[PDB]
Design a protein around this nucleic acid. Structure first.
Ligand SMILES: [Mg+2]
Ligand SMILES: [Mg+2]
Ligand SMILES: [Mg+2]
Ligand SMILES: [Mg+2]
Ligand SMILES: [Mg+2]
Ligand SMILES: [Mg+2]
Ligand SMILES: [Mg+2]
Lengths: 118, 82, 25, 70, 181
RNA sequence: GGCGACACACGUGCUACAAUGCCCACUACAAAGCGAUGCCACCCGGCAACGGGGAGCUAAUCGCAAAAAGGUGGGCCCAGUUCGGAUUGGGGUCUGCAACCCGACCCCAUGAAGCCGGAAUCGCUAGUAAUCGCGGAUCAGCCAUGCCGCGGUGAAUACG
RNA sequence: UCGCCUCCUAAAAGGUAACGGAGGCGCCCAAAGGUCCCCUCAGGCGGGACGGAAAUCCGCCGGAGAGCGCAAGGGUAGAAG
């Protein structure tokens, strides 16, 4: 069911199916279905349409999620555009933000190795 | 990350506040990021020390929890052969 | 998941406690 | 024209928040989650959040500790 | 003559409003929305027809009218394809069907678009016409999601008897064209 | 301010790629050591880190600690997946005069690479290898996945 | 180099030479043929998801600069396309 921006997860437990949304994770998941009052271990296969409506209405509202909060997150990094701080430059150069070790490692932001040789 | 303290340098503020009544001149230095962005005197320039010299940083809202020296990189890097 | 900060197992390995590992009872 | 195109039946279609008509198309009635002409998201404007600004809150969060005040 | 809510909404609301906004002196000087033509740039079907047919019936479902294949005018070795080769579908629809499509477009499809802050107000022709791009085609109520194979889109041209791109800016604004301010 | 720089190369390691596995709940079974300029039972607030109280203990008396792997129950059903946790946004806490460069945790949301490793290369012959947690030194705090110890379950094979 | 085609030399009819200046041909098409009926290009400026100097789409402007199986000339949309 097209809950937020997504619909994908069929026969696979609503507490888990919920996770498949940028903004839900695991904590907001069971938090949303206990506050909506729905059984977590259900089929996800389009069960009681009412439960699905209530779920959708609560989840999609309340807190920001999916493409909207991706925009906000990207905009929070755009904050350090202008004449920003040190943390912005780390987002500029493509290097790790939290001042860690970059002599080795840091491949998750630098990307795969390039090898200079000399 | 402080919560009940949330401090700024007393000496930075002394110089900053007694030069805040009805206006001033942007000629104001420091020697400590340690402080915090300080609201009021936003339209100001604080020459922060980066270990070598005093870099004129400018305040235009937008900044807060970022004290000073984040606006004063201490290294240079610039490039690695390329 | 000895390095995940959201498990009783990772909380053991890290040492610290929390929500995913309460200080007993 | 004759003997190729799909036909267009009368009107009925279900919205996730209320009602919708017209339909025609091919199907008698279909389901639509994100409703349209109703109200949500740029249809009367429902400001979900506001995206906090630092000039406001962070000057009153860091400034909540008014120990640095004056 | 069918009926169509948008069609009525044009006559008994949008129509007199234009005579007030612009002060046309004749019943024909008023902008009349006519001819909406859907086009799909189908390079994807550079060398495939079973990917083109699937795009045909898909289009036939949302407009209630079979599309016609367009063929390459010349030949561009820079990106394959020769003189022939079915590269692109296109269906023209005016009257009745144009309105039934335009309703489900504005009042179902367009809001079903991810985020979507509103149609571009600079996307106007200069002779009173409008065009708009679309990514996913699943945003149409007749598309069932679990029956697709590829996310192919379409270009949409809405032709109008207006002169300036202001009288059309107005005409569509009244019909329900969200313009992101 | 720097030793924490980063287009890169090597060493020693940690965590993994899952179902003899992962999550949650319940429920057992250690040893060796450390502590009243500290360890802090038990209550109270808090989702939690932690904060408010506050008893006992110069300590085979009180406290750090419930050991964990195990067992029982239940849930996932093999899918980059309830595997994996990197990276990043936000919100907090504690030490400290102060944690931007450069601290450790907590919580919400993201969830990357990896589906088992080329040429090569290491360790171990009995409580041994493997695997599991526990203490201590330094130490305000901590970048400890290290070092020095402690016990838990416990192989395989040696013709020559 | 030797035969055929196209343009120039060629002196406003035709024709006209040089071991003068430039290019082509030794095929191809059962549709690229017959007829009847329809339709009009190249470009330029806007508008348009992927899609860019060019793919298809809409809108104006655009008399022929397109096209006409291959050289070149003539011819040609009131068609030969
Ligand atoms: Mg060093
Ligand atoms: Mg991969
Ligand atoms: Mg696998
Ligand atoms: Mg031996
Ligand atoms: Mg002559
Ligand atoms: Mg003559
Ligand atoms: Mg001659």
């Amino acid at each position: 069911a097209r809950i937020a921006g997504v619909e994908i997860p069929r026969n696979k437990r609503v507490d888990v199916a919920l996770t498949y949304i940028y903004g839900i994770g695991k904590a907001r998941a069971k938090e949303a279905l206990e506050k909506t009052g729905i059984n977590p271990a259900t089929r996800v296969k389009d069960l009681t349409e009412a439960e699905v409506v209530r779920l959708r209405e609560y989840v999609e509202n309340t807190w920001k999620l999916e493409g909207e909060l991706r925009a906000e997150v990207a905009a929070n990094i755009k904050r350090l555009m202008d004449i920003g701080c040190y943390r912005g430059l780390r987002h500029r150069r493509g290097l790790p933000v939290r001042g860690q070790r970059t002599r080795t490692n840091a491949r998750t932001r630098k990307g795969p190795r390039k090898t200079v040789a000399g | 990350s402080l919560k009940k303290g949330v401090f700024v340098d007393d000496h930075l503020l002394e110089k900053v506040l007694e030069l805040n009544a009805k206006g001033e001149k942007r000629l104001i230095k420091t020697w400590s990021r340690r402080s915090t962005i300080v609201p009021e005197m936003v339209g100001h320039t604080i020459a922060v020390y980066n270990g070598k010299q005093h870099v004129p940083v400018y305040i235009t809202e937008n900044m807060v929890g970022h004290k000073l020296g984040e606006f004063a990189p201490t290294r240079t890097y610039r490039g690695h052969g390329k | 998941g000895k390095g995940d900060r959201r498990t009783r197992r990772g909380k053991i390995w890290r040492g610290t406690y929390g929500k995913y590992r309460p200080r007993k009872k | 024209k004759e003997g190729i195109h799909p036909k267009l039946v009368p009107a009925r279609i279900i919205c996730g928040c209320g009602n919708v008509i017209e339909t025609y198309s091919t199907k008698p009635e279909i389901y639509v989650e994100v409703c349209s002409k109703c109200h949500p998201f740029y249809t009367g404007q429902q400001r979900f959040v506001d995206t906090e600004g630092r000039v406001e809150r962070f000057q009153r969060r860091y400034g909540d500790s008014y120990r640095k005040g004056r | 003559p069918l009926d169509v809510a948008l069609k009525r909404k044009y006559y008994e609301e949008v129509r007199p409003e234009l005579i007030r906004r612009f002060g046309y002196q004749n019943v024909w000087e008023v902008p009349r929305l006519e001819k909406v033509v859907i086009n799909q740039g189908l390079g994807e079907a550079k060398e495939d027809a079973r990917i083109l047919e699937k795009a045909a019936q898909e289009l036939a479902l949302i407009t209630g009218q079979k599309p016609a294949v367009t063929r390459a005018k010349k030949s561009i070795s820079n990106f394959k394809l020769r003189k022939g080769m079915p590269i692109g579908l296109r269906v023209t629809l005016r009257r009745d069907r144009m309105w039934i499509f335009l309703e489900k477009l504005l009042n179902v499809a367009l809001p079903r678009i991810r985020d979507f802050r509103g149609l571009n107000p600079n996307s106007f022709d200069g002779r009173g016409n409008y065009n708009l791009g679309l990514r996913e085609q699943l945003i149409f109520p007749e598309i069932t999601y679990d029956m697709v194979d590829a996310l192919r889109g379409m270009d949409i041209a809405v032709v109008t008897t207006a002169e300036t791109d202001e009288e059309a800016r107005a005409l569509l604004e009244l019909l329900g064209f969200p313009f992101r301010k």
